RNA sequence: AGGAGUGGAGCCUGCGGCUUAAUUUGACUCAACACGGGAAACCUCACCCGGCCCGGACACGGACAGGAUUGACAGAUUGAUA
RNA sequence: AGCGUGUGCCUACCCUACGCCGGCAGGCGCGGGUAACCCGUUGAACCCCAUUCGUGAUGGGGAUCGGGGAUUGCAAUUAUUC
């Protein structure tokens, strides 16, 4: 549900999955999105909106959950990062042929 | 002769409030009455009996074919 | 599509202009001629007046009833 | 009163009482191990929960 | 002093190298330990139809989810255990520590 | 949705206390799990929030069965005007 | 010639009897039904029918008092009354002569239409 | 080559037809017919017969605090203490 | 014997030993188990051995149908199930 909620939220911001630690006193959940600047927003604003919202749904103790939003190294080899890249090329109004080659040419360059 | 009430076929009867094992011609005459009661009071159970149908919650769509 | 039996008339509110003017009767001097009984309840004290019904008395807030 | 009526009918048992935590559907409910997730819904989220197909 | 670690995982190799690293910690500080007692695996099993409707030949997914469970019994002081249990744990693993 | 101003203000204050508020999509759940003290029903929450969504004061998100609302800047100004608070203090999302 | 009974009791002896004692006479389902309790729920429409039956007017068969309640036991208290048992279509009039005690109200109004067969 | 059979019989069950206020429906050779995880008393429920509710966001206009509007026990009436 | 399941977020509803009462379904006091810990060494059936029956629609077969009795549930009648 975390992974789904984050997909519906950080779709345009280059979401590539979450990784959760259940470390003692600190449920450390790491968003793994491409554009780090756009997920933390204005001076770590939106990322705090995500901390505030998660514990309210999952009932974690007040300030006993911390969200990090680090970067995917070689983002060409994540499928859901290329599928979300492609869907926003298509919804941009680009011809499907152009967009698909654009992805396919990018990930074969990236080293797939 | 000490055979208990739970062991009889006509337990807590409607006309007399009596426990008694009712035998051949009695059982036929008292079966007749039990259906002819339900026929007389127009109760769903007897109406099913009058029309010659299955009463105890069966599906008649497929089974009970003469 | 077309149904036979006619629809149910909806409730319209019988709005009464200056309903406080009926609740009280202002005196010549600085005092009162309060016609309506005040509800002797805990939920509502001296503020809420009771209803002047034609075969009983009824409170509109806490749903208290007194009969003749 | 309508406030008494509106939700009067009990919802303590039967598939009209419980629903999918994803789908919000009254059918194909997997109750086993406290999933409570629809048989289509769980077939989508089986991987993400940790339900590998092997045998 | 008879303090009981209950390791439980989904993934074997992750729990196998942890229970090994805790039994390292028992030997590095040289206190007696009952070995990694292997509790039986729990294969959770959901066998659902494949089709969202009923409009194909009657196929069935057979999902498993294995839950491996190990336990390590120590004769240790409490603080040495709360030190070792912190060191090098990974997300596949789930660690309890019962005092008595 | 006609609801008490007491409830409505206990909603808008709770949205302004954080910069965020949630609710499960269940009209019939008679007590909001967060705000239980002041007995606010769960549908009052959804309708009071979709009011702000329609005239664009709050950001919408929805996963499975749960609404997630994020307060936006013009919504912040509307709420400190509509609740009459100090313009000094902010919701607990501009705090670092 | 003879007067109607129930088990081994006369109607005024049925009518002069508490529910605590009325239990141990008729059948197991109804005994359970009475033991489960007298209704404090919306099913206090049982008790509301107990109030609407106790508007028996002067000498004739009483007026048709209608119900959706098919899940109601024909008590000896009811007997002689004129009840409208609902089907979906028809509030069927039923005068409840005293052999119908123990039976449900819905047991006397067919919710289905009897089938006949054509080609 | 054979084994158990099924097709016969009784019942459970799905489908057509018939019936019906309604008997909700999708699916019709293999690849529809104990299939929709569909063993439905209520809910489920889509069907049909009754009766409440707004859970009609929001922008614009008349109303309107000299009170827009809300809710409300009897009695009637209702199936209902809607 | 071997797969297994078992007290639930909301979710209300868990598996059950043990002692009395009941012919029985069941009811009652009373503990264990969130489980290789308790049900449970899971004393399962078919099978095995020993009586009765004897080619008879028979002690095969258990449909329909009458009366009664218990449980779950807000409610079982068009019979929930036993």
Short mmCIF file of N, CA and C in Angstrom, two decimals, chain D:
data_model
loop_
_atom_site.label_atom_id
_atom_site.label_comp_id
_atom_site.label_asym_id
_atom_site.label_seq_id
_atom_site.Cartn_x
_atom_site.Cartn_y
_atom_site.Cartn_z
N UNK D 1 -37.17 7.84 13.47
CA UNK D 1 -36.28 8.82 12.78
C UNK D 1 -35.38 8.14 11.76
N UNK D 2 -34.98 8.88 10.71
CA UNK D 2 -34.09 8.40 9.62
C UNK D 2 -32.69 8.07 10.16
N UNK D 3 -32.22 8.81 11.18
CA UNK D 3 -30.91 8.60 11.84
C UNK D 3 -30.86 7.20 12.47
N UNK D 4 -31.99 6.71 12.98
CA UNK D 4 -32.12 5.33 13.54
C UNK D 4 -32.11 4.32 12.38
N UNK D 5 -32.89 4.58 11.32
CA UNK D 5 -33.08 3.68 10.14
C UNK D 5 -31.78 3.54 9.34
N UNK D 6 -31.17 4.67 8.96
CA UNK D 6 -30.19 4.81 7.84
C UNK D 6 -29.19 3.65 7.77
N UNK D 7 -28.66 3.21 8.92
CA UNK D 7 -27.59 2.17 9.00
C UNK D 7 -27.99 1.10 10.03
N UNK D 8 -29.30 0.92 10.25
CA UNK D 8 -29.88 0.06 11.31
C UNK D 8 -29.45 -1.39 11.11
N UNK D 9 -29.56 -1.88 9.88
CA UNK D 9 -29.42 -3.32 9.51
C UNK D 9 -28.01 -3.81 9.83
N UNK D 10 -27.85 -4.85 10.69
CA UNK D 10 -26.53 -5.23 11.21
C UNK D 10 -25.54 -5.76 10.16
N UNK D 11 -24.26 -5.39 10.32
CA UNK D 11 -23.12 -5.73 9.43
C UNK D 11 -22.00 -6.33 10.29
N UNK D 12 -22.30 -7.44 10.98
CA UNK D 12 -21.40 -8.13 11.94
C UNK D 12 -20.87 -9.45 11.35
N UNK D 13 -21.46 -9.93 10.25
CA UNK D 13 -21.13 -11.22 9.59
C UNK D 13 -21.69 -11.23 8.16
N UNK D 14 -21.24 -12.18 7.35
CA UNK D 14 -21.63 -12.32 5.93
C UNK D 14 -20.80 -11.41 5.04
N UNK D 15 -20.76 -11.69 3.74
CA UNK D 15 -19.83 -11.02 2.79
C UNK D 15 -20.30 -9.58 2.51
N UNK D 16 -21.46 -9.17 3.02
CA UNK D 16 -21.93 -7.77 3.03
C UNK D 16 -21.41 -6.99 4.22
N UNK D 17 -20.75 -7.67 5.17
CA UNK D 17 -20.14 -7.06 6.38
C UNK D 17 -18.67 -6.71 6.11
N UNK D 18 -17.94 -7.64 5.48
CA UNK D 18 -16.50 -7.49 5.14
C UNK D 18 -16.37 -7.19 3.65
N UNK D 19 -15.27 -6.55 3.26
CA UNK D 19 -14.96 -6.14 1.87
C UNK D 19 -13.44 -6.12 1.67
N UNK D 20 -13.02 -5.92 0.42
CA UNK D 20 -11.60 -5.86 0.01
C UNK D 20 -10.98 -4.56 0.54
N UNK D 21 -9.77 -4.64 1.10
CA UNK D 21 -9.03 -3.45 1.61
C UNK D 21 -8.44 -2.65 0.45
N UNK D 22 -8.36 -3.25 -0.75
CA UNK D 22 -7.93 -2.60 -2.02
C UNK D 22 -9.19 -2.23 -2.81
N UNK D 23 -9.86 -3.27 -3.33
CA UNK D 23 -10.92 -3.25 -4.37
C UNK D 23 -12.18 -2.55 -3.84
N UNK D 24 -12.48 -2.71 -2.54
CA UNK D 24 -13.74 -2.31 -1.85
C UNK D 24 -14.92 -3.14 -2.37
N UNK D 25 -14.68 -4.42 -2.70
CA UNK D 25 -15.62 -5.36 -3.38
C UNK D 25 -16.08 -6.44 -2.40
N UNK D 26 -17.33 -6.90 -2.55
CA UNK D 26 -18.02 -7.89 -1.67
C UNK D 26 -17.85 -9.32 -2.21
N UNK D 27 -16.84 -9.59 -3.04
CA UNK D 27 -16.67 -10.89 -3.74
C UNK D 27 -15.19 -11.28 -3.84
N UNK D 28 -14.95 -12.58 -4.09
CA UNK D 28 -13.62 -13.19 -4.24
C UNK D 28 -12.68 -12.79 -3.12
N UNK D 29 -13.17 -12.79 -1.88
CA UNK D 29 -12.42 -12.30 -0.70
C UNK D 29 -11.53 -13.41 -0.14
N UNK D 30 -10.24 -13.12 0.00
CA UNK D 30 -9.23 -14.02 0.62
C UNK D 30 -9.05 -13.58 2.07
N UNK D 31 -9.69 -14.30 3.00
CA UNK D 31 -9.71 -14.00 4.46
C UNK D 31 -8.48 -14.62 5.14
N UNK D 32 -7.95 -15.71 4.56
CA UNK D 32 -6.83 -16.53 5.10
C UNK D 32 -5.66 -15.63 5.54
N UNK D 33 -5.16 -15.84 6.76
CA UNK D 33 -3.97 -15.16 7.35
C UNK D 33 -4.21 -13.64 7.50
N UNK D 34 -5.47 -13.22 7.62
CA UNK D 34 -5.85 -11.80 7.65
C UNK D 34 -5.27 -11.02 6.49
N UNK D 35 -5.50 -11.50 5.26
CA UNK D 35 -5.29 -10.71 4.02
C UNK D 35 -6.48 -9.75 3.87
N UNK D 36 -7.69 -10.30 3.68
CA UNK D 36 -8.95 -9.56 3.41
C UNK D 36 -8.72 -8.64 2.20
N UNK D 37 -8.40 -9.26 1.07
CA UNK D 37 -7.99 -8.63 -0.21
C UNK D 37 -8.58 -9.47 -1.35
N UNK D 38 -9.10 -8.83 -2.40
CA UNK D 38 -9.91 -9.55 -3.43
C UNK D 38 -9.01 -10.44 -4.30
N UNK D 39 -9.56 -11.57 -4.74
CA UNK D 39 -8.85 -12.69 -5.43
C UNK D 39 -8.17 -12.20 -6.71
N UNK D 40 -8.67 -11.11 -7.29
CA UNK D 40 -8.03 -10.36 -8.41
C UNK D 40 -6.95 -9.43 -7.83
N UNK D 41 -7.30 -8.73 -6.76
CA UNK D 41 -6.47 -7.72 -6.05
C UNK D 41 -5.19 -8.37 -5.54
N UNK D 42 -5.30 -9.51 -4.84
CA UNK D 42 -4.16 -10.27 -4.27
C UNK D 42 -3.30 -10.87 -5.39
N UNK D 43 -3.92 -11.21 -6.52
CA UNK D 43 -3.21 -11.78 -7.69
C UNK D 43 -2.31 -10.71 -8.31
N UNK D 44 -2.64 -9.42 -8.13
CA UNK D 44 -1.84 -8.25 -8.56
C UNK D 44 -0.73 -7.93 -7.53
N UNK D 45 -1.02 -8.07 -6.23
CA UNK D 45 -0.15 -7.63 -5.11
C UNK D 45 0.56 -8.82 -4.43
N UNK D 46 0.44 -10.04 -4.98
CA UNK D 46 1.05 -11.27 -4.43
C UNK D 46 2.57 -11.10 -4.35
N UNK D 47 3.19 -10.64 -5.44
CA UNK D 47 4.65 -10.40 -5.55
C UNK D 47 5.09 -9.43 -4.44
N UNK D 48 4.38 -8.31 -4.29
CA UNK D 48 4.75 -7.15 -3.43
C UNK D 48 4.63 -7.53 -1.95
N UNK D 49 3.71 -8.44 -1.62
CA UNK D 49 3.50 -9.00 -0.25
C UNK D 49 4.64 -9.98 0.08
N UNK D 50 5.07 -10.79 -0.89
CA UNK D 50 6.07 -11.86 -0.72
C UNK D 50 5.50 -13.25 -1.00
N UNK D 51 4.61 -13.37 -2.00
CA UNK D 51 3.97 -14.64 -2.41
C UNK D 51 4.53 -15.05 -3.78
N UNK D 52 5.65 -15.76 -3.76
CA UNK D 52 6.32 -16.29 -4.99
C UNK D 52 5.55 -17.52 -5.48
N UNK D 53 5.42 -17.66 -6.80
CA UNK D 53 4.94 -18.88 -7.50
C UNK D 53 6.13 -19.82 -7.71
N UNK D 54 6.03 -21.05 -7.20
CA UNK D 54 7.11 -22.08 -7.30
C UNK D 54 6.52 -23.44 -7.65
N UNK D 55 5.50 -23.89 -6.92
CA UNK D 55 4.81 -25.19 -7.13
C UNK D 55 3.33 -25.03 -6.75
#
